[PDB]
Amino acid sequence: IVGGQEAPRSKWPWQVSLRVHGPYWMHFCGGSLIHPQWVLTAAHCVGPDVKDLAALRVQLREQHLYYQDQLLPVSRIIVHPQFYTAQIGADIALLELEEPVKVSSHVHTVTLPPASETFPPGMPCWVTGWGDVDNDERLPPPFPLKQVKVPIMENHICDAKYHLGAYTGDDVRIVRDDMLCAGNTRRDSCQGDSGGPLVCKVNGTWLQAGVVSWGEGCAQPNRPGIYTRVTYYLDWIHHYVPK
Amino acid sequence: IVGGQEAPRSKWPWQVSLRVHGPYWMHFCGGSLIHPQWVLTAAHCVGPDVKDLAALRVQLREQHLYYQDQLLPVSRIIVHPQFYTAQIGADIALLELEEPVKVSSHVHTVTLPPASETFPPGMPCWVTGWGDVDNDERLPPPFPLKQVKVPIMENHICDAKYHLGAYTGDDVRIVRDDMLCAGNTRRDSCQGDSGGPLVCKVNGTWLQAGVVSWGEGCAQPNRPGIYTRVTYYLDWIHHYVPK
Amino acid sequence: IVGGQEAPRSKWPWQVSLRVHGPYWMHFCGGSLIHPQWVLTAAHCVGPDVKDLAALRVQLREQHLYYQDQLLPVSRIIVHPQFYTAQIGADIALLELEEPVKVSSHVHTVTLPPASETFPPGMPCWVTGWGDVDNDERLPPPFPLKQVKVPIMENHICDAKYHLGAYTGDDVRIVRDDMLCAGNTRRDSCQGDSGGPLVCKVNGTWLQAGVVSWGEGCAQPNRPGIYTRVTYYLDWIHHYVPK
Amino acid sequence: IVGGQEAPRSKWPWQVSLRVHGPYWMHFCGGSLIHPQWVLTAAHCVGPDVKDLAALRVQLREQHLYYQDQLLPVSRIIVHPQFYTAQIGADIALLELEEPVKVSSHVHTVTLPPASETFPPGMPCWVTGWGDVDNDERLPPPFPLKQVKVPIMENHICDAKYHLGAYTGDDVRIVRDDMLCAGNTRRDSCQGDSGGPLVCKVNGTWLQAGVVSWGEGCAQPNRPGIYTRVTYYLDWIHHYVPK
């Protein structure tokens, strides 16, 4: 997370950390708990190549990475079948846990948006995670969960920005319709935040608008953060995740 | 080049090395001389973001990088306006030299196929360059130009290979019609060979079939080298480059 | 610590971590609390070149680095004036804290041997720290304090081992009289354990025999861990540190 | 080499490159040819641990590293028996080739000094090699041999400089009598130059005064280059090398 601050303990009870087995169970991506037995993340975190489930664990909301881990194994990885890269799109995946988790005030699910929410500019939205705090700059020990409030920008404006300084033709769309843009040169998500939630407070309720997907670097001029737009994927999600 | 050998000095007289200004004029990509004043390369070598022309140079056929350079300035970079990443396609670009080269025995142009050329599956073709000799293993000093023989394959087969051990749906296309595949777990192009030529000798004439574009790593199981298919962009190339 | 395990929280109440200012207060060396206001460490951790006192802090006994630090400022660094490199010797230093620590169950001083103490060859001693778990392999998060049991050996034996597979003449001394050796190919101190304590329980009392100083790598054949011999510098230590 | 320039072809016909076997025969140190079958280098290049001769080669004077190698194997490594580290001293070694080399105007031996030469300040002296051109900055391709003219400074002045900014006691000698000091903040030897020659022109004849040994970094204030003083080691050399 570029900018923002350490999250209070009482916030974002749905944030998860994904871990891969190596010299230690290392954090490589975020996620969100959307049901007691399902985690929502980015496909590029766990694909497009098939991975060994045994080498994967999930860790539920922790204030500091690694310090009080209780790692949960995963029975299934479902990756959106149109996923190949994040720039093409469908950067979205589901992790099914081997057991349903017990929920509490500090660990519980996030609400998905109804299909028709657009998340226009000026909505209040936060992104969270344990990624880099700037380009090629890791989150320091003790690895506190960070949050940063990020401005949403309309897709056609974001797409036009991405064309600035580029050879790509103006009519060749960069930012796709299944994506959402947010952030600026002070406030952004970054590497290690992928797969985590962008959430907005609508009519009193926190809703997941996006999954951290990609960008050109982190907090660079005219290159805002790109997120998988969750509304585009609700039917796919509900094919696997009970309501 | 993975699984290759050093090229004899009489061969590949069209090969070029692209150089970027830092502590020295470092090689970052290959190219091919297709006209006395024009180099054909990959877009991803030089875009999608516009970079400074003064920081770029071209080096013509050389047995050993850096030893006896004669570096040529570039007057123009033309990047296909559809390019944004290699996986989406249109990974092709032209460099116009400030001067025509005085062509010779050691240096000369490669012939581009006619639009109708069907390079048959299995045809033995050659890819050349100064890239990595395996995954994350750089070509050692003294940086001899390498060559490797690689069998062309049908896009349908290469697509189906990319889908083995992958979550991507089988009907979702990974290898596209503007691409061409070649190579296997012993023979392949690699990082720093990008932009460089895949050539096939067809009824006795060396034709450029492909531009080194991308892959999942180098020489991995079921992940052949992917090349921009030259016949596909013939008209765009001829829009700028004289016959 | 190589070939060790995580220390129980009741043990090694004298262990300290030295911290240097960068992007965070990074651990670079261990130390031992030998008086409420004094830390014993290795000179090479802080010299031979004079560095800024404000960039240094001390952290007292902690189960996991970084998690719940309470960092203590240092009012003075005293480096043995004979020190220039560990191989020459006099690798020993004192840090005077700005304040006496309020000693307790969890935090307290280690006892230094009397000048006459002959720690016998073979005696089982313990070395503790947050250093590397093998050559060029850093202690993983969450950075638990480790311990390992290491047999003391006679300098004459350790010297002769250092000379095996070496050009150094057999009469030319490598391990010196102000040094003490311990460890084997399974058990040893390592990089980042430097300055930290080698302790032996002698007729029921934990005495500090050594300061982690140097070695040829960690846990290599015929290259035991070398430690500054505490009895040797007792008078210098007592020149500054009250009984 | 820090400062100075690429050496003309016609100079330093006695410079050698030492190579270790890995992905390629990589340069790790210099040396000088002092007899057709003997090379003079620094012990720390090839010790103090016994190394496998088969993994070692010597390369005689080359204008550019790697480009026209003819590597020679070594039958014997003789390391000064008092060597353990460079700061202790006796940083000197001999490589015996399996065959005597043929000498020419471009490849031939350097003259050793008579025992009584002191090489006082103001003598004109050059150091040569293929090392780093500044701290942690490698010599770029095409790796030209560099030279730099360096001022000699008297041992007691150099030793006093090394004490400046240090904890080490003023009467604890840092720069030993078997060493020689040369260089300043613009002109110095560096990592990869070790084992190579410092040579001075005395009464018309080029003489090797030093072997590149150590220092604190390269071209830092008050930290000039330190060399093994060849006059101290002439009897040892002549025990092995015919006159």
Ligand SMILES: CSc1cc(C(=O)N2CCC(c3cccc(CN)c3)CC2)cc([Si](C)(C)O[Si](C)(C)c2cc(SC)cc(C(=O)N3CCC(c4cccc(CN)c4)CC3)c2)c1
């Ligand atoms: C199977 S597709 C694929 C393959 C590879 C791969 O294996 N490669 C590349 C191809 C190479 C090659 C070359 C020549 C020949 C051959 C044939 N054998 C192969 C071998 C090695 C690598 C990638 Si990759 C994931 C490494 O893409 Si890019 C680093 C070039 C990339 C592309 C883009 S598009 C503008 C942005 C960024 C980038 O800036 N990132 C990634 C996203 C990060 C991020 C994360 C989270 C949030 C945000 C928003 N602030 C940003 C920031 C850093 C990075 C993709």
Ligand SMILES: CSc1cc(C(=O)N2CCC(c3cccc(CN)c3)CC2)cc([Si](C)(C)O[Si](C)(C)c2cc(SC)cc(C(=O)N3CCC(c4cccc(CN)c4)CC3)c2)c1
């Ligand atoms: C002012 S004295 C000095 C200076 C430098 C330094 O600045 N250098 C080296 C010389 C270079 C140079 C070359 C040519 C010319 C010039 C002149 N311009 C300079 C410049 C860079 C470096 C050192 Si240094 C600390 C980097 O010594 Si060594 C890496 C060669 C070394 C020497 C020895 S002696 C056998 C062992 C190890 C080693 O294996 N270690 C260190 C100890 C560690 C350790 C720590 C704790 C416990 C244990 C026990 N298992 C082991 C393990 C790794 C390492 C010391």
